[PDB]
Amino acid sequence: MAPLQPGDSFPANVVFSYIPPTGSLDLTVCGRPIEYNASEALAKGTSVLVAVPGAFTPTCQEKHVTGFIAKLDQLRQAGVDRVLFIASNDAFVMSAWGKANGIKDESILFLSDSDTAFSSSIGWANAGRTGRYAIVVKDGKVVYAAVDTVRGSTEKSGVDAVLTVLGNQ
Amino acid sequence: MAPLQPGDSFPANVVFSYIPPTGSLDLTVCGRPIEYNASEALAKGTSVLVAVPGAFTPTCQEKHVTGFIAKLDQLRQAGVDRVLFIASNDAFVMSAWGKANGIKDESILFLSDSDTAFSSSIGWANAGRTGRYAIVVKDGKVVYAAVDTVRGSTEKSGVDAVLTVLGNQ
């Protein structure tokens, strides 16, 4: 366990599991998971990595991913090259959740932190679920890492917080 | 652990977690899980309880629940009062999976075997997932319980096997 802080290098050897998007929103289209090498992807450019406690939790409590989708253009303008949403759900569930939210491309990738391996390694996981947190990386270096512990809050991990981070650098 | 066999009473104190269906197929409608008392529900009438290793696994490998949906009328004619599909996925994921399969009522309920508590107690669970199996109950007594171990097979737990069981009694 090592709490990630600004200035830290993004940990090496971080891998997620995901079903690559196809352009389709049909939840019955066949898919097969592959490994996503997150440490390699984050070594260049600006990345936003967001964890949620669970796929398919209701909007009545959760408007986390919807907020990012609504402001994807602002994120593109702020220089974001990739947005990654992770949870402990497997790749099949994460793929369906991405499609349920209308994402058919790479604007946001939906991936599995298998067995909360990554989230646990940075201290933000419990009882088989990741925490709710956001990490901003530039060229392999952490610029921002914060976790929401208040239930139903996205103050630290929401899109508005991430956009504020970017608007400063 | 106690392998269920024909003639056994259905175990007592079996509970699942599910989001009651609303009539809507919208995957963004808000929901809140409740306990489903399966031992009580199965004490009267004819019930079919089917477990799958995971919600949202692709059709290319899996046509298990689709087979039951296609033959719901035959099941009703055979005297089935309730069909229950369970997996280790949480109630939110199971609810979305039911809606993704077009079910908006109680023809098939989609529920969570939390922590594979039930499936483990009868010996058909491993590494956090239930097995693929089907149990037929009449008035609290097991009439049929069989598990598919061949990957991608529904020979024992598919709808055709269940319909054969019913056509004999």
From Swiss-Prot, chains A, B:
There is a cross-link at residues 44, 63, 99, 141, 156 (Glycyl lysine isopeptide (Lys-Gly) (interchain with G-Cter in URM1)). It comes from Chaetomium thermophilum (strain DSM 1495 / CBS 144.50 / IMI 039719) (Thermochaetoides thermophila). Conjugated to URM1, a ubiquitin-like protein, in response to oxidative stresses. The attachment of URM1 to lysine residues exclusively depends on the presence of a peroxidatic cysteine in the target protein, with low specificity for the particular residue, motif, or structural context at which urmylation can occur. The URM1-conjugation reaction is mechanistically and directly coupled to the process of cysteine persulfidation, transfering the sulfur atom of the URM1 thiocarboxyl group to redox-active cysteine residues in the target protein if it is exposed to oxidative conditions. InterPro entries: PRX5-like, Redoxin, Thioredoxin-like_sf, Thioredoxin_domain. One of its GO terms (biological process) is hydrogen peroxide catabolic process. It is found in: Cytoplasm. SUPFAM superfamilies: Thioredoxin-like (SSF52833). The gene is AHP1. The active site is at residue 60. The lineage of its organism: Eukaryota, Fungi, Dikarya, Ascomycota, Pezizomycotina. GO terms for cellular component: mitochondrion; peroxisome. This is Peroxiredoxin AHP1. One of its GO terms (molecular function) is metal ion binding. It catalyses: a hydroperoxide + [thioredoxin]-dithiol = an alcohol + [thioredoxin]-disulfide + H2O. The modification Cysteine persulfide is found at residue 60. It is an enzyme of class 1 (oxidoreductase). The active site is a conserved redox-active cysteine residue, the peroxidatic cysteine (C(P)), which makes the nucleophilic attack on the peroxide substrate. The peroxide oxidizes the C(P)-SH to cysteine sulfenic acid (C(P)-SOH), which then reacts with another cysteine residue, the resolving cysteine (C(R)), to form a disulfide bridge. The disulfide is subsequently reduced by an appropriate electron donor to complete the catalytic cycle. In this typical 2-Cys Prx, C(R) is provided by the other dimeric subunit to form an intersubunit disulfide. Signal peptide: none annotated. Its EC number is 1.11.1.24.
